[PDB]
Amino acid sequence: QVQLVQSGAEVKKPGSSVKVSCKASGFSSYAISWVRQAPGQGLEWMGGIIPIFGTANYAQKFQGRVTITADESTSTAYMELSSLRSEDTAVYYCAREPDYYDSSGYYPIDAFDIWGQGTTVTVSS
């Protein structure tokens, strides 16, 4: 029943940097990825972070621009997108890659079970 709460819709200028937060309701942060959704278009994976494995990876087209950070004290994952432009106008989602744990062992799931509400990013124009 856990949910992901992301930051409000932001209106920024071209060339600027937008930092979108994503907080987990509970107590500790888990594996979180970021998925872009342009109007009328398809879903696009930008990157992700594994605070448990201490790793953050991004997609080739977003590499060098996007920055993902995770704070285990406040359970908040961030999406920093630098040098904004027209095509960056999209709805940005944070999503958890779930992990299963029992007496038999730890089982990671390579899918996105819970998603955030979505942060609409509009660029000027």
Partner 1 sequence: SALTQPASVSASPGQSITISCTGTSSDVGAYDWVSWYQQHPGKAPKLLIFDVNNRPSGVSHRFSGSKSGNTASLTISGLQAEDEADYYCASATLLDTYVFGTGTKVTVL
Partner 2 sequence: YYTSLRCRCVQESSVFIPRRFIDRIQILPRGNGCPRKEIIVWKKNKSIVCVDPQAEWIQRMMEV
Which of residues 17 and 100 has its CB atom nearest to partner 2 in the complex?
A: 100
Which residues, other chains included, contact 81 with Cβ-Cβ below 8 Å and sequence gap of 6+? 17, 18, 20, 65, 66, 67, 88, 121
Beta bridge partners of 23: 5, 76
Instruction: Point out which span in 1-9, 58-66, 77-85, 102-110 binds partner 2 (CB under 8 A).
Output: 102-110
Residue 48 engages partner 1 in binding (rule: CB under 8 A): yes
Which of residues 7 and 33 has its CB atom nearest to partner 1 in the complex?
A: 33
Residue 109 engages partner 1 in binding (rule: CB under 8 A): yes
Residue 60 engages partner 2 in binding (rule: CB under 8 A): no
